[PDB]
Amino acid sequence: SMSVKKPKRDDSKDLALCSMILTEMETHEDAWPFLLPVNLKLVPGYKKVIKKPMDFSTIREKLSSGQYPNLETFALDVRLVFDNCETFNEDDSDIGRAGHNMRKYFEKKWTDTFK
């Protein structure tokens, strides 16, 4: 509360560490469905169904331009990528399996780096 604070966590490396995680996601062999925005002209149903499209290149641009105020907002966009994937793709599809794999990969890096 006012004049009552928990000890100050060192957040000075968060930006660099989120960048490294994102690099590792970008270079994973199953990242291909997620590297670029879904083409909303060419993919029927996507625009109407997926209220907040997100992809790795968009996260990268937001990260590089100071549009994440903290590491929670960064994780929310990463997860949004996989939540969108699940909304639109059958579990038993290449993209569906890609999403589950990348989410797992992300969550481990996230826990190991920050928890």
UniProtKB/Swiss-Prot annotation:
- The residues covered by the Bromo domain are 9-113
**Compartments in which it is found:** Nucleus
Expressed in which tissues: Expressed at varying levels in several tissues, whereas a smaller transcript was expressed specifically in testis.
Q: Report the superkingdom from the record.
A: Eukaryota
Q: What does this protein do?
A: Regulatory subunit of the ATP-dependent BRF-1 and BRF-5 ISWI chromatin remodeling complexes, which form ordered nucleosome arrays on chromatin and facilitate access to DNA during DNA-templated processes such as DNA replication, transcription, and repair. Both complexes regulate the spacing of nucleosomes along the chromatin and have the ability to slide mononucleosomes to the center of a DNA template. The BRF-1 ISWI chromatin remodeling complex has a lower ATP hydrolysis rate than the BRF-5 ISWI chromatin remodeling complex.
Family classification: Belongs to the WAL family.
Q: How does it assemble?
A: Component of the BRF-1 ISWI chromatin remodeling complex, at least composed of SMARCA1 and BAZ2B, which regulates the spacing of histone octamers on the DNA template to facilitate access to DNA. Within the BRF-1 ISWI chromatin remodeling complex interacts with SMARCA1; the interaction is direct. Component of the BRF-5 ISWI chromatin remodeling complex, at least composed of SMARCA5/SNF2H and BAZ2B, which regulates the spacing of histone octamers on the DNA template to facilitate access to DNA.
This chain's protein is named: Bromodomain adjacent to zinc finger domain protein 2B
Q: Which residues of the intact protein are shown?
A: 2054 to 2166 of 2168
